[PDB]
Enzyme design. Structure first.
Site, PDB file in Angstrom:
ATOM      1  N   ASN A  56      -0.390  25.871  -7.526  1.00  0.00           N
ATOM      2  CA  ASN A  56      -1.783  25.720  -7.120  1.00  0.00           C
ATOM      3  C   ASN A  56      -2.724  26.118  -8.248  1.00  0.00           C
ATOM      4  O   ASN A  56      -3.579  26.991  -8.095  1.00  0.00           O
ATOM      5  CB  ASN A  56      -2.084  26.569  -5.879  1.00  0.00           C
ATOM      6  CG  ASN A  56      -3.543  26.493  -5.468  1.00  0.00           C
ATOM      7  OD1 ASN A  56      -4.094  25.405  -5.297  1.00  0.00           O
ATOM      8  ND2 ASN A  56      -4.179  27.652  -5.310  1.00  0.00           N
ATOM      9  N   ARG A  57      -2.564  25.470  -9.390  1.00  0.00           N
ATOM     10  CA  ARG A  57      -3.404  25.771 -10.531  1.00  0.00           C
ATOM     11  C   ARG A  57      -4.029  24.494 -11.061  1.00  0.00           C
ATOM     12  O   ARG A  57      -3.441  23.417 -10.971  1.00  0.00           O
ATOM     13  CB  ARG A  57      -2.573  26.435 -11.629  1.00  0.00           C
ATOM     14  CG  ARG A  57      -1.954  27.769 -11.223  1.00  0.00           C
ATOM     15  CD  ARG A  57      -3.027  28.822 -10.988  1.00  0.00           C
ATOM     16  NE  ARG A  57      -3.788  29.089 -12.205  1.00  0.00           N
ATOM     17  CZ  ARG A  57      -4.825  29.919 -12.276  1.00  0.00           C
ATOM     18  NH1 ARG A  57      -5.233  30.570 -11.193  1.00  0.00           N
ATOM     19  NH2 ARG A  57      -5.453  30.098 -13.431  1.00  0.00           N
ATOM     20  N   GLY A  78     -13.045   0.372 -17.580  1.00  0.00           N
ATOM     21  CA  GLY A  78     -12.405   1.585 -17.094  1.00  0.00           C
ATOM     22  C   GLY A  78     -11.560   2.338 -18.106  1.00  0.00           C
ATOM     23  O   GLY A  78     -10.781   3.214 -17.731  1.00  0.00           O
ATOM     24  N   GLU A 112      -0.879   7.672 -15.037  1.00  0.00           N
ATOM     25  CA  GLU A 112      -0.168   8.281 -16.161  1.00  0.00           C
ATOM     26  C   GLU A 112       1.101   8.973 -15.679  1.00  0.00           C
ATOM     27  O   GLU A 112       2.129   8.950 -16.364  1.00  0.00           O
ATOM     28  CB  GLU A 112      -1.076   9.262 -16.911  1.00  0.00           C
ATOM     29  CG  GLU A 112      -2.347   8.618 -17.467  1.00  0.00           C
ATOM     30  CD  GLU A 112      -2.099   7.644 -18.623  1.00  0.00           C
ATOM     31  OE1 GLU A 112      -0.934   7.270 -18.891  1.00  0.00           O
ATOM     32  OE2 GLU A 112      -3.095   7.245 -19.268  1.00  0.00           O
ATOM     33  N   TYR A 146     -10.515   4.991 -21.076  1.00  0.00           N
ATOM     34  CA  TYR A 146     -10.847   6.404 -21.263  1.00  0.00           C
ATOM     35  C   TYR A 146     -12.064   6.644 -22.152  1.00  0.00           C
ATOM     36  O   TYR A 146     -12.912   7.470 -21.826  1.00  0.00           O
ATOM     37  CB  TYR A 146      -9.654   7.172 -21.842  1.00  0.00           C
ATOM     38  CG  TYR A 146      -8.526   7.417 -20.860  1.00  0.00           C
ATOM     39  CD1 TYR A 146      -8.777   7.948 -19.595  1.00  0.00           C
ATOM     40  CD2 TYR A 146      -7.202   7.165 -21.218  1.00  0.00           C
ATOM     41  CE1 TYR A 146      -7.728   8.226 -18.705  1.00  0.00           C
ATOM     42  CE2 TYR A 146      -6.150   7.440 -20.342  1.00  0.00           C
ATOM     43  CZ  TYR A 146      -6.419   7.970 -19.092  1.00  0.00           C
ATOM     44  OH  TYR A 146      -5.376   8.259 -18.240  1.00  0.00           O
ATOM     45  N   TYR A 195      -3.039  -0.149 -14.701  1.00  0.00           N
ATOM     46  CA  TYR A 195      -4.450   0.205 -14.817  1.00  0.00           C
ATOM     47  C   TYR A 195      -5.107   0.227 -13.441  1.00  0.00           C
ATOM     48  O   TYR A 195      -4.804  -0.611 -12.585  1.00  0.00           O
ATOM     49  CB  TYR A 195      -5.204  -0.831 -15.658  1.00  0.00           C
ATOM     50  CG  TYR A 195      -4.975  -0.790 -17.147  1.00  0.00           C
ATOM     51  CD1 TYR A 195      -5.437  -1.829 -17.956  1.00  0.00           C
ATOM     52  CD2 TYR A 195      -4.325   0.282 -17.758  1.00  0.00           C
ATOM     53  CE1 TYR A 195      -5.261  -1.804 -19.334  1.00  0.00           C
ATOM     54  CE2 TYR A 195      -4.142   0.318 -19.143  1.00  0.00           C
ATOM     55  CZ  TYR A 195      -4.614  -0.731 -19.922  1.00  0.00           C
ATOM     56  OH  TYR A 195      -4.449  -0.721 -21.289  1.00  0.00           O
ATOM     57  N   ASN A 219      -4.233  19.555  -7.886  1.00  0.00           N
ATOM     58  CA  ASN A 219      -4.515  19.093  -6.535  1.00  0.00           C
ATOM     59  C   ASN A 219      -5.966  19.331  -6.145  1.00  0.00           C
ATOM     60  O   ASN A 219      -6.543  18.540  -5.399  1.00  0.00           O
ATOM     61  CB  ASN A 219      -3.585  19.768  -5.525  1.00  0.00           C
ATOM     62  CG  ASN A 219      -3.480  18.988  -4.230  1.00  0.00           C
ATOM     63  OD1 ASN A 219      -3.129  17.806  -4.235  1.00  0.00           O
ATOM     64  ND2 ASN A 219      -3.781  19.641  -3.114  1.00  0.00           N
ATOM     65  N   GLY A 237       2.476 -15.913 -16.215  1.00  0.00           N
ATOM     66  CA  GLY A 237       3.172 -16.583 -15.128  1.00  0.00           C
ATOM     67  C   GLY A 237       3.317 -15.786 -13.841  1.00  0.00           C
ATOM     68  O   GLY A 237       3.931 -16.256 -12.885  1.00  0.00           O
ATOM     69  N   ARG A 295       3.673   6.381 -15.234  1.00  0.00           N
ATOM     70  CA  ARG A 295       4.175   5.923 -16.531  1.00  0.00           C
ATOM     71  C   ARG A 295       5.137   6.881 -17.225  1.00  0.00           C
ATOM     72  O   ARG A 295       6.096   6.449 -17.876  1.00  0.00           O
ATOM     73  CB  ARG A 295       3.015   5.678 -17.500  1.00  0.00           C
ATOM     74  CG  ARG A 295       2.054   4.566 -17.140  1.00  0.00           C
ATOM     75  CD  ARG A 295       0.981   4.463 -18.225  1.00  0.00           C
ATOM     76  NE  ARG A 295       0.059   3.359 -17.984  1.00  0.00           N
ATOM     77  CZ  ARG A 295      -1.188   3.505 -17.547  1.00  0.00           C
ATOM     78  NH1 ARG A 295      -1.678   4.715 -17.303  1.00  0.00           N
ATOM     79  NH2 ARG A 295      -1.948   2.435 -17.355  1.00  0.00           N
ATOM     80  N   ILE A 300       0.827  -1.196   0.000  1.00  0.00           N
ATOM     81  CA  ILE A 300       0.000   0.000   0.000  1.00  0.00           C
ATOM     82  C   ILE A 300       0.867   1.253   0.000  1.00  0.00           C
ATOM     83  O   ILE A 300       1.832   1.348   0.752  1.00  0.00           O
ATOM     84  CB  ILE A 300      -0.905   0.063   1.247  1.00  0.00           C
ATOM     85  CG1 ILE A 300      -1.890  -1.106   1.246  1.00  0.00           C
ATOM     86  CG2 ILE A 300      -1.657   1.387   1.276  1.00  0.00           C
ATOM     87  CD1 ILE A 300      -2.743  -1.169   2.498  1.00  0.00           C
TER      88      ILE A 300
END
Length: 258
Positions: free
Chosen positions: A190-191, A116, A172, A118, A75, A136, A45, A175, A3
């Site tokens: 903060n945008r 799920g 993403e 897009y 995913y 955020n 496997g 990735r 976790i």
């Protein structure tokens, strides 16, 4: 399953960066790296006890939800909020059996009738990724939306949009260092803003880029891949070299050549 925790409450570029680094560390093992780019575990496997990782998200509203990610492709396969868990519609029998190993202690288990991906989520949300703001603020709100779904406090379109937000800011970003960077910028100032073409095209090309790099001849692509700059202009990728600073994880396609 492992976790990883993250909270939008007081999030900073550094806390977000540490979180994403932690997610990547649990997604890959370090056994597969090609042209300096780590590759996710091969699904073939792979023992079920190593198939998923959990990402627990908390927000300023003191609400928490736990996303379950498939280590073979990053995913988001479902989530848990309190005494309820929801899973996207499995694409095959193997995946359907695999998710029965997640959130086994939850009182109420539900499996959505939709996938799920897009395309599906955008359809349900009533908006394309290019029109859904990320940052955020959107993440904090997405966590609340996911949390209140079981009690009818969240409409489907809003739930879908919230998944879209979580998937991009977590999966993403994991990735692509490039996408992680774009999220860091949003947090730093903060945008909130929708993803530009460079972000969307990278997300859409992850599978193709992974295959192109893995099937390349000494790093050279047989066929160039077209991506987009922030201003929407097109440019081609002919080699893995230019992607090393851009892609952080690849989905396993084939064994590396000798």
């Amino acid at each position: 399953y492992p976790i990883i925790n993250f909270t939008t409450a007081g999030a900073t570029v550094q806390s977000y960066t540490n979180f994403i680094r932690a997610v990547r560390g649990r997604l890959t093992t370090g056994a597969d790296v090609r042209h300096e780019i780590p590759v996710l575990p091969n699904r073939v496997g792979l023992p079920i006890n190593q198939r998923f990782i959990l990402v627990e998200l908390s927000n300023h509203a003191e609400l928490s939800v736990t996303l379950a990610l498939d280590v073979t492709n990053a995913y988001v396969v479902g989530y848990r909020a309190g005494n309820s868990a929801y899973f996207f519609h499995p694409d095959n029998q193997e995946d359907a059996e695999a998710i029965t190993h997640l959130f086994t202690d939850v009182q109420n288990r539900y499996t959505f009738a939709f996938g799920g991906n897009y395309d599906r989520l955008e359809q349900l949300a009533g908006n394309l990724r290019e029109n859904i703001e990320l940052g955020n603020g959107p993440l904090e709100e997405a966590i609340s939306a996911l949390y209140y779904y079981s009690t009818g406090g969240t409409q489907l379109p809003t739930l879908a949009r919230s998944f879209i937000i979580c998937i991009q800011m977590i999966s993403e970003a994991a990735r692509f260092q490039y996408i992680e960077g774009e999220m860091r910028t949003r947090i730093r100032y903060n945008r909130r803003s929708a993803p530009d073409p460079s972000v969307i095209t990278l997300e859409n090309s992850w599978g193709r880029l992974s295959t192109a790099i893995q099937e390349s001849n000494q790093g050279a692509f047989a066929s160039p891949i077209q991506l987009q700059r922030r201003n929407g202009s097109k440019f081609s990728v002919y080699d893995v070299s230019i992607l090393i600073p851009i892609i952080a994880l690849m989905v396993y396609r084939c064994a590396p050549p000798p």
